[PDB]
Amino acid sequence: HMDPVSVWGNTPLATVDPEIHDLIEKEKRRQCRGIELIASENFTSFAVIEALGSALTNKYSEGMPGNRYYGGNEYIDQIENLCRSRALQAFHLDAQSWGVNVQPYSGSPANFAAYTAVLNPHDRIMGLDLRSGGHLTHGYYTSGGKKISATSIYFESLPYKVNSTTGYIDYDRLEEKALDFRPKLIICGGSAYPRDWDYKRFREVADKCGALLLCDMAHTSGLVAAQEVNSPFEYCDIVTTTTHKSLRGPRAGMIFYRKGPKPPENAVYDFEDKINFAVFPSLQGGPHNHQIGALAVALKQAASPGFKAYAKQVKANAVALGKYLMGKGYSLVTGGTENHLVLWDLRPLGLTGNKVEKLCDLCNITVNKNAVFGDAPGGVRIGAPAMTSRGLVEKDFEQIGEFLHRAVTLTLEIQKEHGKLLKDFNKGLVNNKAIEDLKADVEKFSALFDMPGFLVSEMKY
Amino acid sequence: SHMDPVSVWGNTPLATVDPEIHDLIEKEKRRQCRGIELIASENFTSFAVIEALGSALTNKYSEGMPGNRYYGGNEYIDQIENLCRSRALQAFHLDAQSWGVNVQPYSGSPANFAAYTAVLNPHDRIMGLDLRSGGHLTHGYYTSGGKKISATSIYFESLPYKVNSTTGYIDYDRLEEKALDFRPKLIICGGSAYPRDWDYKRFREVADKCGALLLCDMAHTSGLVAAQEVNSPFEYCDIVTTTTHKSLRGPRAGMIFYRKGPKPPENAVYDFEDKINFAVFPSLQGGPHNHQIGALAVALKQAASPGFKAYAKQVKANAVALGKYLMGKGYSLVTGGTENHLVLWDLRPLGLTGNKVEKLCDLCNITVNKNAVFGDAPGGVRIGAPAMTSRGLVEKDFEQIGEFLHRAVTLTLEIQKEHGKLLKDFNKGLVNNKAIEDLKADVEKFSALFDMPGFLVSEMKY
Amino acid sequence: HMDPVSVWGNTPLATVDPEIHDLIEKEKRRQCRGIELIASENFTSFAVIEALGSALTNKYSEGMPGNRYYGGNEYIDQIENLCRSRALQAFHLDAQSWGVNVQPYSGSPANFAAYTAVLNPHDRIMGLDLRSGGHLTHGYYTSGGKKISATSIYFESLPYKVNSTTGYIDYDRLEEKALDFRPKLIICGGSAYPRDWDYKRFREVADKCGALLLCDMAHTSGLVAAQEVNSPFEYCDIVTTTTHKSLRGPRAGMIFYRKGPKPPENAVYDFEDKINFAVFPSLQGGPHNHQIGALAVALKQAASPGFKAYAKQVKANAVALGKYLMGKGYSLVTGGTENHLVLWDLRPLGLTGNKVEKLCDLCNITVNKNAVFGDAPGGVRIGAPAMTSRGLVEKDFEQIGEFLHRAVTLTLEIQKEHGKLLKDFNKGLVNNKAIEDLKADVEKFSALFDMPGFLVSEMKY
Amino acid sequence: SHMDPVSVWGNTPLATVDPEIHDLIEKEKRRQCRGIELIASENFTSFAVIEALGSALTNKYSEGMPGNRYYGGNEYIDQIENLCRSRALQAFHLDAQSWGVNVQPYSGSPANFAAYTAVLNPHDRIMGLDLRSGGHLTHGYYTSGGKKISATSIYFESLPYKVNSTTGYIDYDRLEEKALDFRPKLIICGGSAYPRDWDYKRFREVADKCGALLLCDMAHTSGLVAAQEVNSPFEYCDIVTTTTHKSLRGPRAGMIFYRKGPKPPENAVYDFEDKINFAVFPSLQGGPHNHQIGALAVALKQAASPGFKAYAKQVKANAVALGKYLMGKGYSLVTGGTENHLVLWDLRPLGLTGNKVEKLCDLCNITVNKNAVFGDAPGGVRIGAPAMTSRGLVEKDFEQIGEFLHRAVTLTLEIQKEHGKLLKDFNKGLVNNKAIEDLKADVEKFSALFDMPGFLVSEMKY
């Protein structure tokens, strides 16, 4: 005998799966009772979450709106049409000049789909080196030549780097590499770059070597939407993005592409059908329609005046956080920031990023180690989106800087006393009284702000 | 000038923040329960699954593996994913020493492409069931004109195997011959529109004969496999990939199962584990979708319950009872029946195309899909049992479903006989048709007589 | 001090290099005092040899006639123009409809160049299976999937086979394979196929799957020139060939290609520039101009009435050789021949090709073992060109059959007496009195005919 | 109706069988010895080499290796090829335990492509000296527009390294940087128009730093290498390929040298031997050209003689003496001199293109070729010494060659100054020019004053 539908199908999670329920409660507590500085993280809205956990997960709609395999997509079509039109609006794109595909499962699928669409296998791609602040999906092989990223497995990648002494992109060496290598595709955008991007310069480099130009704006997409950084759409052929991170949406991807007539022969752009086809049927199956509904929510939120003020506040919080760190004598790559993150150079203090990351982590401050100047990594990457989504402003971020300051000095006390090597450093973390104290008034600080996505006046813990 | 307070943008429900999208989800909820969903790849998951899926787990970046992550703060994400891995092994009756699983693939297609990337180099030869014979796009597909459609056929070299063109069964002898000429490095079994079980033993013998890896893509029948209601691919395949929705009744996600430990006969062991994981991350994917992994772990504990075993038996019996009902009316099914969750209905002996039947079925809120028949315009429809079984339908309810389909195909012939065979003519019989409208009304009324998982019918906007 | 030019540069080989001189004399003796049945072998003319050993080896002429890199090619241009025009004449080709490139160093470079010209890397090719009578350069991988032929390394090959019971090409299975596999290129021609080729059928198969059709006529090119077999030019897009073998030229290659207007849109053939460019600059360096001069000699000889009678005699000699072998109860694949070779099936006699080949070799009869019916190989391949070039006619070839008959029966005496296994069989070759006798009146038989290329009334031995 | 008797078609000399071709070879023989051949890749081989080349060795099929052939009857072909292999090792002072050679490549380009195929998979990265900087097509070449020209760039992934744009020397620091970004699997050294020796030690250090194999293509300077007159690539390279004509003075053929035995620092040995041989046959070539292998074995014994060592010293000195003569007139050479067999003459400081100088030189039967300068219409000419040294010319004769070139470039400027810089104008100064004709006459008269190898001047038709 089958279970009644009411028993297996309508019964709440807390009763069907106490184990998993309990873990989500604990994870919910972890998220609002520490300090989140991972620059690729954010806290999304309840409305987004409600669309994401919805009956939309039950519909199969392989194809495009108005062009499906299966019937019954009357309402799914309107959800996706609305999501695509809200995506153009949020980024101030004219529909005769730009299209978007909102079906990629995530950022990396959006990148690989775009590659598939405009490149043949083994075509050459250039992307910002991983050690200089780029992303795995822009190409990565090891010094031994092992192809790590699938972009490097199925295409031929060669990275460009930042200037080793200023930490800025080396646009002259980017051009020299592009002219020797002759990539079919140049990627800009990145994950740990703390400055804006000269898209006009990338566009001149691309024209000079005959390359397509793609911007991956996953990290700054929320800043792009609020027109708080340079718009890649002004100069790029294709723009890919995640929809979480600074956009504050669900986990999903988008591919934007130029439509209509080209600039100066006398022909038009060829991207739309190649990109839709690359996503389906080539690479993906049914779209995740609950993601698309949730993203359409996030994109509406991303157009509001409130979101334009959020992105403004993300920048000023990062500035004030770094202004405060340099105030203590600390070193930031490029000496400041123009976006949502700072990159802290710890090599002047004789420390590695691993050490600061491990100790911060013991106080519920989450950062990640990061290579510096294209170089064990010498820095940490610190981002503002997540804590700004909880309503922290400059003074709160200057206070986060104080916690980081306290964290790094305790990291030095341990290194002075126990040894430079990692195994030695670890000895100073076993029952460290001062680490416990910083964890304490870090947790008390984080308890002072609100939290989107769920009511803290409701959590199990 | 002011930032929106957290309560205003962040805690407000979707019904206030986004009334348009709320309205559409509400409308989609009613469509899902006022019609008869017979898409074989469709299901209705549980409210428990949905609650994990829409949760704060979407906020955590956890690239890497449990215990080897890039970022800190994965204390509880690691436990959710480990429990998901161990429940995936338990739900398919696998010893943790012999089998491992990766539960990070975003969907079934990412699961397949990451399995390919793990064990193949670019341009390695793959063999899979022909799309026209019931296979899936991600197993390989190029058109008669040579255009490579599937990514699998773009970055690898694929060559399809087909059903016997007169019986509808997989032609195992022609599979062995193609595999010995072509020498694929990977043979894929499993399919989307195949109505019989799979002879994995025979696939193993072919793979051993030509030196190929053997992978089962069990997406369509994963629920039947977990319930031990169809043949187990784990007994003979090196790798097993799957979706987690469809007959498994979970979220939209994917899993890659892989053998571990000592190989059968020198003294070597299986090398799959590290290559699979590394292929998912860092080669192909970014951060995992931790809300899907939570929803999946929920679905996998549900799939291990005694009711799910009974749901699976019931799915098979509803397909069989629906099929026997159709052949009781003189209809033809490919292979004359079913051994799983779907039946393939050959409409060519009635002079109809699957399009004409699928369109009129749609206008009564009966969702089927047209489908190629016997490896051959598509001349069949595909009909699946999982979705309506999840709503509690049993054999007599699927005989009633066969009744409405019978009425559908009768009205379809009437219209063809009156207006003509061209599609432009056919459409003329679908406007102001009190017989279609009586069937739509009869489908709706029949449909409202059953419960619905995932949400409460007593709470809908419509 | 340098050597005078007269000492190092004009002094004959016999004085500069007695070792190498002596080996060429011995090799010259070997060639006229045994029986040459390797179907890919011939004996070329003295005139050809004189052009081949000439100052033409000293000129660098990368490029095409009238389109060279280096100057000083006034006379080299006329040699190559004349060779290309003599190549079209010898094969009865209209110059507005066919072009030829005579620069490939050999047959295999001519095949790989042609592939390079019309295919992209990893494009699919179908060729006659090696075990069914095809050539390495048409594609070969092992049962373990190791890519042996470069055609299979750099392209994707799939072979078609002969019918396992008639030994004829299976044209129905060729079409079924081509429709599943969808090759960009289908190759016909072969090395051990004893029948003619249905080029009209290959052309219908190629049109049905959208493939280019290339014939590799290396083995039968002399028969094609004398219009004694079916002309591939009638139905093929590209024809490649060696220029030795039955053409009786130097060792070199040629690529023939369709020019002018296509058959039924309204466009023209695209092969000429792609093929010239593939040979140079893509694949080869300077052409071997002494080969081209020698080939131009061979092609003139190939147009003469004498050569048309040679090719007629090559066929009738093979027919009479096989007619005689079947007269003794022996089995030939397809039961006869239409070209220059027969394929002897030795499995009815319980023997392998290795055994007959080794024993024949001990009597200065040269044959090679060969797989039969696409299957240790069960047959030997026996060809008529070489011995026909020495003026042997039917009765002489029937006498060669008698020698083969004597050879196989002695091979059976040894197998009956010593054992089926190879190591056992070898025991019966150590100081075998009867093998010595057959070697004796094989050597006396071969001494009875003339020899082109050098005067036997002049050899050291 | 009758077969031509063997004597008639087979033994008759070329002068009777084919008078046209005989006439053309006779005419080509006179062109070769009435002019001044300065193509750096050109030489005049010996009558002994030619006699082996045009011989009954062309009649033998011998696919495979000595002692492992497909066909029988290779008793003496095996001995010729073994003696060729052992003489190739002896002529380059290689221990048979440390080095092996394959002498079946049909030419230099087949030698290179077979070496690539042996040690690389398709699409592996290769680095070679840029064509514009003096490299060879077979080391990699694609145009600014992306079109892949070289087969090496079609089936592999190439990226060039260049000369320093102001000194003309290989930029070893920029080589190391490119090689660490690109990570080629193979670095190629050697070139066609490079006027200095190679720092193989430094190439080895770069190869070890990035994990690449190191191959020298020594085609241009193989004669100087055998004579130990330039740096030995064998001391630092894994593989060495070469033509056998050019400065080695042999037939047109190729060789692939490869290291054997124990590797320097674990405990492994070199794996090159079998892969190289297998790449030549069966992967890439058919039957070897046994007449070339015989001619080559002749050339290699000649290359081991004391006169060849003196010929090689003399080639270097004639290039140096020609270069010093040109700079004595104010001309410019890339890098200011030569360390080998050629000089690169930069004509841009005279406002001339290499074309204009090469055309007027040609009209006096002085064969040079125009050539790119400093990695940059081509602005130099390339001038080689091997061919004219083989005719016995010494330093004073090459100073006389520099005199005629000086006259050539003076007449070239006069014509540019009178008629103009456009090529259409330039040609106007080449018709009825008693000064060109006096130089052509002076070249011919100077040219006839020296012997000629390969054939007897006392026997020519002209």
Side-chain angles (χ1 to χ4, degrees), chain C residues 33-34 403 437-447 449:
Chain C
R33 290 193 128 151
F403 288 139
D437 294 278
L438 176 64
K439 181 190 207 170
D441 42 281
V442 152
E443 185 170 319
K444 142 171 170 208
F445 174 81
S446 58
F449 305 92

Side-chain angles (χ1 to χ4, degrees), chain D residues 4-67 69-131 133-265 267-314:
Chain D
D4 277 356
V6 177
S7 60
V8 174
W9 80 263
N11 299 115
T12 298
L14 164 71
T16 304
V17 152
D18 198 349
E20 278 181 276
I21 292 286
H22 184 265
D23 190 64
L24 288 178
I25 297 188
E26 292 302 324
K27 284 188 170 165
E28 169 62 10
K29 283 160 65 189
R30 167 183 55 185
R31 184 203 69 73
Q32 289 190 10
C33 57
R34 294 269 149 287
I36 291 180
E37 182 51 86
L38 300 184
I39 292 284
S41 68
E42 212 66 293
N43 217 328
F44 302 122
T45 192
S46 74
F47 184 57
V49 164
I50 284 173
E51 285 209 291
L53 177 82
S55 79
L57 296 174
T58 195
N59 289 324
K60 198 34 191 162
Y61 247 105
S62 59
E63 299 169 286
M65 295 267 91
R69 306 279 189 196
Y70 277 9
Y71 303 156
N74 281 309
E75 186 175 8
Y76 310 111
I77 296 289
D78 284 9
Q79 303 182 34
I80 300 179
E81 188 177 346
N82 284 332
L83 186 53
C84 193
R85 300 222 232 148
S86 70
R87 290 175 173 185
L89 303 183
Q90 302 180 291
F92 292 93
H93 313 272
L94 315 170
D95 192 273
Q97 312 239 354
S98 306
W99 283 98
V101 68
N102 187 298
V103 303
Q104 293 184 11
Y106 298 131
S107 219
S109 304
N112 287 359
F113 198 77
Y116 307 156
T117 295
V119 305
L120 309 177
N121 294 302
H123 309 285
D124 281 351
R125 289 184 183 194
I126 303 172
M127 263 166 101
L129 177 62
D130 192 42
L131 205 48
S133 286
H136 192 265
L137 264 161
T138 66
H139 300 172
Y141 179 53
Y142 48 87
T143 62
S144 42
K147 169 135 216 292
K148 305 163 191 270
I149 301 308
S150 172
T152 308
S153 293
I154 288 181
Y155 301 105
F156 304 96
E157 291 289 337
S158 64
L159 171 79
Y161 62 82
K162 311 153 130 187
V163 298
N164 178 302
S165 61
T166 67
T167 67
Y169 284 89
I170 283 149
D171 198 329
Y172 289 90
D173 287 336
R174 279 273 333 130
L175 164 85
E176 170 154 335
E177 203 201 317
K178 274 194 163 80
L180 293 167
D181 304 330
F182 192 59
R183 300 290 168 165
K185 268 71 83 202
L186 183 74
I187 290 170
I188 304 175
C189 55
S192 294
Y194 189 57
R196 293 294 175 159
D197 208 332
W198 289 74
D199 197 340
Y200 304 113
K201 188 165 130 71
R202 184 94 177 76
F203 266 86
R204 167 51 51 196
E205 301 173 346
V206 172
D208 284 347
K209 271 193 183 179
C210 65
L213 301 173
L214 183 54
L215 181 154
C216 180
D217 181 351
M218 83 170 148
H220 256 69
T221 54
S222 60
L224 310 193
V225 179
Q228 304 180 284
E229 286 292 295
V230 292
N231 288 343
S232 179
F234 295 101
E235 166 166 351
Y236 294 107
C237 301
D238 299 292
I239 294 156
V240 174
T241 65
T242 190
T243 53
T244 48
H245 49 295
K246 311 202 176 162
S247 69
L248 195 50
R249 201 146 77 173
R252 287 187 188 270
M255 299 188 287
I256 305 168
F257 294 86
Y258 51 84
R259 275 172 191 226
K260 296 169 69 177
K263 307 164 75 171
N267 178 56
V269 282
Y270 282 119
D271 216 15
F272 297 131
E273 188 157 42
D274 289 331
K275 295 169 173 179
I276 308 272
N277 295 332
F278 199 91
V280 180
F281 183 81
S283 304
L284 277 157
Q285 296 189 173
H289 287 184
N290 286 319
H291 54 290
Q292 296 175 202
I293 293 167
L296 170 57
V298 176
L300 288 166
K301 167 198 176 77
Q302 288 188 294
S305 68
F308 193 87
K309 176 145 181 67
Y311 162 78
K313 302 184 37 101
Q314 189 71 58

